[PDB]
Amino acid sequence: QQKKTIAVVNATGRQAASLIRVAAAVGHHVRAQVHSLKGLIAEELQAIPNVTLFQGPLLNNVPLMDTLFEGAHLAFINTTSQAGDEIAIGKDLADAAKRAGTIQHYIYSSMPDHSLYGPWPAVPMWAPKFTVENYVRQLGLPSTFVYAGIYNNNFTSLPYPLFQMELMPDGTFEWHAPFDPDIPLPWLDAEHDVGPALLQIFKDGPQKWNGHRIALTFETLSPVQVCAAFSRALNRRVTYVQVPKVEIKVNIPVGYREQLEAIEVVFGEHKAPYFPLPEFSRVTDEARKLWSGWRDMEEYAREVFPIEEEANGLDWML
Numbered sequence: 001q002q003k004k005t006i007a008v009v010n011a012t013g014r015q016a017a018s019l020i021r022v023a024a025a026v027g028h029h030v031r032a033q034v035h036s037l038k039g040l041i042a043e044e045l046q047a048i049p050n051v052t053l054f055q056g057p058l059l060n061n062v063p064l065m066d067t068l069f070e071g072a073h074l075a076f077i078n079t080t081s082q083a084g085d086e087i088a089i090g091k092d093l094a095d096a097a098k099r100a101g102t103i104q105h106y107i108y109s110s111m112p113d114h115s116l117y118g119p120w121p122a123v124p125m126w127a128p129k130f131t132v133e134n135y136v137r138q139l140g141l142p143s144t145f146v147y148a149g150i151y152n153n154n155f156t157s158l159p160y161p162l163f164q165m166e167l168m169p170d171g172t173f174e175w176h177a178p179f180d181p182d183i184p185l186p187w188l189d190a191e192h193d194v195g196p197a198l199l200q201i202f203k204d205g206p207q208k209w210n211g212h213r214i215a216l217t218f219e220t221l222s223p224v225q226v227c228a229a230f231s232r233a234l235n236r237r238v239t240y241v242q243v244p245k246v247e248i249k250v251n252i253p254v255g256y257r258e259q260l261e262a263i264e265v266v267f268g269e270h271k272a273p274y275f276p277l278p279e280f281s282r283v284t285d286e287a288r289k290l291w292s293g294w295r296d297m298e299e300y301a302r303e304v305f306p307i308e309e310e311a312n313g314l315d316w317m318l
């Protein structure tokens with residue numbers, strides 16, 4: 001009954017773009033911030049009638065935030081550490097949403113602070129989000145926090161850290177990571193499943209979800225199980241190899257290296273849970289109730305992975 005307007009930031013990011021596409025298709029008007037209008041996705045998103053893009057930085061730009069929230073009733077916020085000041089930006093956005101007065105439900109995409117649950121270090125790009133989560137909880141605005149599982153499409157044969165599905169000379173594939181071969185990890189098809197799940201949270205409403213933490217993951221798989229889904233999907237031998245240090249074969253930003261080293265220690269060295277919150281110990285229950293049509297790792301490897309690889313210029317799929 002009159003779809004409410006949704007405000008979003010980082011519009012071209014996976015989580016935001018997924019929500020935007022489905023929300024607009026069902027009638028929601030969307031107000032989305034993007035750092036720049038250029039780009040395959042930004043251009044794709046601005047061509048959707050129900051969507052309006054507002055280009056500019058979030059860093060020290062509250063005015064843009066006030067503009068974004070004007071006339072909005074719902075918000076889905078996901079920040080990045082890129083411009084630095086992620087905590088600051090997250091608080092400014094929450095304050096801007098409160099000030100707009102019209103936001104009835106504010107969803108923030110949070111991550112754990114591992115050092116709170118054991119003799120473990122805080123993963124640099126995750127812990128900050130939890131801080132923002134604590135802040136948002138204090139605002140007199142209904143809020144819900146989603147914890148995203150590992151994206152299925154992090155996988156690529158390009159020489160990128162942690163999630164390379166390396167193509168060997170013999171046509172076989174190998175995934176090398178510090179993750180214990182058998183401890184199940186939480187996965188997520190961002191493209192297809194983030195959008196529908198977030199929309200159901202909005203449909204259910206703030207009385208049901210105010211204050212809740214939801215694990216946005218629809219299936220748990222150990223690395224060994226992931227490789228077998230790929231092997232089964234591509235009819236190729238795909239095997240997992242546990243490695244102490246992440247193989248970093250290309251140059252990466254300083255902050256990303258620190259993130260990876262934290263990962264070597266937390267999952268490699270300590271074998272700590274991905275979601276170390278007591279609430280998340282099935283961890284997939286709520287997510288599946290929210291969106292029944294979620295896709296698994298085998299469908300990704302077989303139906304999307306080949307196309308994404310060809311799009312990146314790879315030829316193994318001929």
Ligand SMILES: [Cl-]
Nearest residue numbers: 002003004202
């Ligand atoms: Cl609505």
Ligand SMILES: [Cl-]
Nearest residue numbers: 046048049051
């Ligand atoms: Cl438009």
Ligand SMILES: [Cl-]
Nearest residue numbers: 137138139141
């Ligand atoms: Cl509150």
Ligand SMILES: [Cl-]
Nearest residue numbers: 249250251252
């Ligand atoms: Cl490089």
